[PDB]
Design a protein around this nucleic acid. Structure first.
Lengths: 93, 80, 96, 104, 104, 93, 80, 96
DNA sequence: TAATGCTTGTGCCTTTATTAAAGAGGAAAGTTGCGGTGGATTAAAGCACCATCGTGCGGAGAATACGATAAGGCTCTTGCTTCATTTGAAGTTATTGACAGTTGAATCGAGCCGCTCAATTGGTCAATTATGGAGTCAATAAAGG
DNA sequence: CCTTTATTGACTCCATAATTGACCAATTGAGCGGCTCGATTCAACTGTCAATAACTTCAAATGAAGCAAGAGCCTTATCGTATTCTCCGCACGATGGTGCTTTAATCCACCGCAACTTTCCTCTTTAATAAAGGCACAAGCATTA
């Protein structure tokens, strides 16, 4: 079976940030596990948010509130800014 | 509506310490306790206000506080 | 005038306040403090009374637990008076 | 057949994340804008961690990121350390810290 | 119309618990035997806690269980105290404990 | 709206255990919150168990494993015994 | 298999303490550390064995250990 | 014969072992211990190698953190030697 | 300071195995289409949240006398560190075998979805009894003699 | 031990409110039915976990020597504690306004389901070079003088 991971996208981000720095396989796996953990945290938190207000749909608003509740401080603010920028760019095109 | 941290008087801190089994209390314990209480309240109220804001409300309910507490591993019964 | 030697009245207060379930912090100052703290997150907030009551219960329980840990830290160092360094150590080990 | 990732200007797989959200049964319905937001947030977090890890690798005078550099980057930043307080990195080591009262 | 509660010999609402499990979207399907098991477990836990609380109330020369008795029962039993270590119970008070080194 | 609670069943259990002991409303609410908390814990743990093994269904086996994983020691043993007894009674008649 | 807890030698405990910043070590630290390590391993292995038993397997995999650790708030990275 | 005064070699070991990522406990004794412990829960168990490796990593990280907390407790009491009471206090505050 | 042990940091060659790179094809993303179900909008009630006012009384702030607890300094002895010798068990390599995890099908059992119903339970009103409050007595414990 | 005195548990009586009970309805558990899928059992393959043997050699066990750190003891001074006095603002009771929370109805728009295409990512295979390892070497720290 094919195993699905974020290795390609993480490598693309690394090349965007550090053009001349490479990454080992162990660090790649650790980053993949970190991203999976964050994805799961945000998903369960957004599901709880939807359950509390009796809405059957997860929207960008639930994701934004999950980001605010889970990530701390400046990290959460920057994440919210980036997400809002991405959603605006997706909608305006 | 500011400086209400001094509203937590010294006898109140002494009573809270006595409830905890403390026999003698130093002089700087009052300031230290005020600081730590302010930090705790800041965290809990931040989470509760976020929960209230998500529901498009303007009034903070007890359920928001209960959820904010449960987020930090401090589940509280009697307010469900 | 009969004066109790220092320390016995503290022991009586320890015995008495551990027996009761009453809240030790006055309600109105705590309410004002909560409103002031919340003013920095979102202006024009209304508080349901049960929310402030729950906040007071949680804060008092947290402070009692912290003071128990502080007393353990103070006893560990062969003292009976709790000090700011005891609170700092207790919060450090708890991960706060 | 334009991909949603390039439609929103992202590197992460908006489509794959949307499929993950659908399969996880977190809710009956998933909005169209939710996976884009989630992909952007994950991309930002990965970029931040990788930037700090590359910085740690450079200050060590290596040209490859290893778990030690990830551990150092995580424990040298207050926000990530708050987010990753309970997280143990395999082969991460520890931050070198010797207490003052132990010094000669 | 025989209720499943008395069909299985329980007091708790097997039907209500089944409806809660189905509504919570914990899985696409729930077995016929799962709500009965869950109802039995919840009934046992409630019976244990209530028996300890009633014993605590009786030891205090009282007739009605109050939150103080629940707190005392929880903190006097090792198993529940391990299960309920992080729990704050409203109006529960604390267990009377004075360190031996503080005594005169 | 009609609020659904376990007050009646908790009172029946109390009368079964302590015939002459009553319970105040505050203690009843605390017991209700305790039962809701335990229900939620077991439900999410069983959902995770089903997710790990890719089974779309929750059965009594998932509940039993959730009980053995969440409750500690002799409490978990007795809970498992009671659950098995109830399931056998339900199935055998 | 018996008394393999003594397989955690004194130099190993000294090295673990040194990694933690400890300058001097008492004599009973070795026994105390052996006891606490045995308790931790008992808890984690119990949870891992329960996870393995549920899946109707006979071999404990790394994923079971990772799940058991995550259940206790000690998520481990690099074994996914 | 040149002898180092006590404490300097300990400081050098502290500096050296904090720089490395190697595992400090030997693999085979830890594997035997893990199998012995698991024998009490279910007989005839097989262990995947990565499972034992993960167990060793987790145990070593936990012990390092516990020893850091123990060192803080020992320093609090104006000592440089860690003692069993320090470990007991640290575990008590952590809630274990 | 100062010479010297001395362990650690630094510079260079090797290889290898660990990471960068190319391909087949298949497995999943994008598109079109439909439609009903969920979300956004609007009007209305009703209760709940806030601001005002009065008082009066128990709890908080401020001195004051003081004694006992934390802190500093000295001494000692004993427990822990450093060094050296011997050894014994972990580490690495190669081998075998059989047990168990996994994938693929058939399939028969079983749980989801509709419709009815009606019976159990939840909102609302009555109450008397267990507990709260006040007053008094006896028992308990502490402090100076 | 003793005696006085401050403090609290018990005891009793009255108030009170609140927990138990009865009742109307409402909504939901139960029964029957149809039907698609899923989880059970069987089978084979195949991956690897356990057990074996062998050799090396470095890390663990043990013993000596010694020294410095933890603990005990004395002294002091200063700082938290207990008691009293004054006052002040929290708690309780009433009020009145309004805003904002919840509910009901409507409309529209958007996301799930399905089939088809297509193109992107993922095991398998190939290589090339970064770093561990080894070897030689410089260099700042520790130590006794």
């Amino acid at each position: 079976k094919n195993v699905e991971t974020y290795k390609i996208y993480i490598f693309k981000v690394l090349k965007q940030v550090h053009p001349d720095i490479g990454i080992s396989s162990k660090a790649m796996g650790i980053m993949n596990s970190f991203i999976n953990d964050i994805f799961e945290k945000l998903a369960q938190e957004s599901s709880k948010l939807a359950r509390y207000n009796k809405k059957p749909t997860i929207t960008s608003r639930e994701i934004q509130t999950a980001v605010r509740l889970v990530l701390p401080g400046e990290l959460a603010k920057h994440a919210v800014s980036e997400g809002t920028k991405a959603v605006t760019k997706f909608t305006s095109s | 509506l500011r400086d209400n941290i001094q509203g937590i008087t010294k006898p109140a801190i002494r009573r809270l310490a006595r409830r905890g089994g403390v026999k003698r209390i130093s002089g700087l314990i009052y300031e230290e306790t005020r600081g730590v209480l302010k930090i705790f309240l800041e965290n809990v109220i931040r989470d509760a206000v976020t929960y209230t804001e998500h529901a498009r409300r303007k009034t903070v309910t007890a359920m928001d506080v209960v959820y904010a507490l449960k987020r930090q591993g401090r589940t509280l019964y009697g307010f469900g | 005038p009969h004066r109790f030697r220092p320390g016995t009245v503290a022991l009586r207060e320890i015995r008495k306040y551990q027996k009761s379930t009453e809240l030790l912090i006055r309600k109105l100052p705590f309410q004002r403090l909560v409103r002031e703290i919340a003013q920095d997150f979102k202006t024009d907030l209304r508080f349901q009374s049960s929310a402030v009551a729950a906040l007071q219960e949680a804060a008092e329980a947290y402070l009692v637990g912290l003071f128990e840990d502080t007393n353990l830290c103070a006893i560990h160092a062969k003292r009976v008076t709790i000090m700011p360094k005891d609170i700092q150590l207790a919060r450090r080990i708890r991960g706060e | 057949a334009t991909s949603r990732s390039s439609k929103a200007g992202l590197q992460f797989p908006v489509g794959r994340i949307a499929r993950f959200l659908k399969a996880g049964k977190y809710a009956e319905r998933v909005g169209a804008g939710a996976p884009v937001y989630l992909a952007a947030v994950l991309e930002y977090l990965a970029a931040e961690v990788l930037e700090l890890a590359g910085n740690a690798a450079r200050d060590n005078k290596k040209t490859r990121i290893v778990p030690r550099h990830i551990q150092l980057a995580v424990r040298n930043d207050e926000e990530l350390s708050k987010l990753l307080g309970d997280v143990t990195i395999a082969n991460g080591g520890v931050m070198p810290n010797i207490h003052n009262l132990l010094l000669p």
